[model samples]
Target chain A: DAGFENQKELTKMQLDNQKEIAEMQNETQKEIAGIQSATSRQNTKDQVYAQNEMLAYQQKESTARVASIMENTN
Target chain B: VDAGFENQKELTKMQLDNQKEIAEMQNETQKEIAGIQSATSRQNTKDQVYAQNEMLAYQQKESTARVASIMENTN
Candidate 1:
């Protein structure tokens, strides 16, 4: 089995190298997660905006159609 | 307008939840990183012992290989 929990299980140089790699991995993962969350949030906002925009357009179209029919009847 | 208001409120709640989740994740990640750093610091105490032992192992292997080569040359 692999040795110690830390560099204790490894030579000083090996431990140093592993620690360096771990730190880099941790930082990169943290940044990746942050970016993913932001992207998801932005997508959610865009979807909601699009839905609202579509609903407004539909309501306007319906109102115009109704007004035109009333004018034809009169 | 009422429907829009409701949707907006729900979206606000969702945003708040997202913020809370992000905060929790950040805290957890920071704690984990701190723990690793602590382990690194503690292991520093055994640095010399660990490094020396590994070096000794390497030297032993090298010595055995050298003897094998010398025996082969004589044969």
Candidate 2:
């Protein structure tokens, strides 16, 4: 009564529920993997672009820092 | 001499072969990327339709189940 309300009927329901859940989970997993692969490709492109920008900014900042130091020395 | 000419000819042929190989490889890679892109797009659309169908099925099933349970309790 507490768990297997009718053992026979409950077993049938449990099996049906598990089958549906598994089917949905499989589809969800496949979609997730596809999305991840697409996203990863885009992310790599963005990361490379961002790194280039950072390097350029750092170079500009260093140039200004050096110029400021030279002015002070003069 | 003959040895120098033979080596030059071999190098030329090797260069030509390598260039041909690289071209083929690039074409193959491009085709693969295109194929994957198409497959991913189609799968995405299919997944959306499938999800909606599953949701409606569950809603109908659950309603019927609830009614059955309620009737059992009443009896």
The global C-alpha lDDT for each of the candidates, from Candidate 1 onward, is 0.54, 0.55
Worst 10-residue lDDT window for candidate 1 chain A reads A1-10
TM-score of candidate 2 to 2 decimals: 0.32
Task: Give interface RMSD (Å), model 2.
Answer: 31.9
Weakest lDDT window of 10 consecutive positions for candidate 2 chain A: A1-10
Model 1 pairs whose backbones collide = none
- Model 2 alpha-carbon miss at residue B26, Å: 1.1
**Per-model TM values vs. the true structure:** 0.30, 0.32
lDDT of 2 at B31: 54
lDDT of 1 by residue, B33-60 (tens): 7656545544553553455444555555
Best by TM-score: 2
Deviation in Å, model 1, residue B42 alpha carbon: 0.7
